[PDB]
Amino acid sequence: IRDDGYRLWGNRTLSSDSKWAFVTRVRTMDLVMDAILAGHKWAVDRGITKTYVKDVTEGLRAFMRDLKNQGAVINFEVYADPDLNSASQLAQGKVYWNIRFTDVPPAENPNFRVEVTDQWLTEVLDVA
Amino acid sequence: IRDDGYRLWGNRTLSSDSKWAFVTRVRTMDLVMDAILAGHKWAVDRGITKTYVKDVTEGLRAFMRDLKNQGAVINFEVYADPDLNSASQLAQGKVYWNIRFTDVPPAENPNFRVEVTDQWLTEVLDVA
């Protein structure tokens, strides 16, 4: 829109699912993880120690926290989903964590409500 | 009247109302306002400001004063009738002023009273 192809217009994206209505939502949810993986590269091998679970849940809380600091998200919550982490899964290498967080809602549709009254009329003009 | 249609004769006019007996009265009361309006043209629009009332009451005192200077009237009095100027009327554009003035009474009916006496008789003639 706007003069001679001034600018883009539309944060919305083709999605049947309303939750992923904003490209901001999708892009955040994707690139957040790009930053996580490019940083937890060390975590994808290595002999599982007693402190492996904690090394990772803290490493996550580092990258995640940094993103919060620079605006990227608004609060978050990382931990190591217990109802899944088991001896069997661990012997087979696997292990799970949760990373529930909130993404910056892009301000859209500011509703400037306006009333042209005659309230401030006597306050000026008449005599004064 | 007078020889071979010398001149006109009669300042009086057809009027049931004695106040408007003189054409001088009517013509003055009319053309005075013609001069006022042709001069306060600017005053018939424009966003009413705090000083609108004063701009006009002074503009009136200018044209009115000038007319006094060149004889047209004899004193006058302009102001902005308070018991009418209100927030309601102003919101609806309207506004009021008074322009009470006096008009030049045309000298008519000079009464030359004359007595042919014999007072200044001895003052001359006899002896001297």
Q: How many CB atoms lie within 10 A of CB B22?
A: 19
CA distance B78 to chain A (A): 17
- What ranges make up the beta strands (E) of chain A? 73-76, 101-103
Resolution in A: 3.5
Distance CA B47, CA B43 (A): 10
Which residue of chain B is at minimal alpha-carbon distance from A122? B87
Amino acid at residue number B8? L
Q: Single out the residue of A127, A119, A63, A78 nearest to residue B48, CA to CA.
A: A127
Residue with tokens 């083709």: A14
User: Does residue B79 contact residue B85 with C-beta atoms inside 8 Å?
Assistant: no
Residue B87's region, left for phi above 0, alpha for psi from -120 to 50, else beta, is: alpha
Q: How many CB atoms lie within 10 A of CB B26?
A: 15
Residue with tokens 């661990």: A90
Amino acid at residue number A45? D
- 3-class state of residue B74 by DSSP: strand
Contact yes or no for A126 and B91 at CB 8 A: no
CA distance B22 to chain A (A): 39
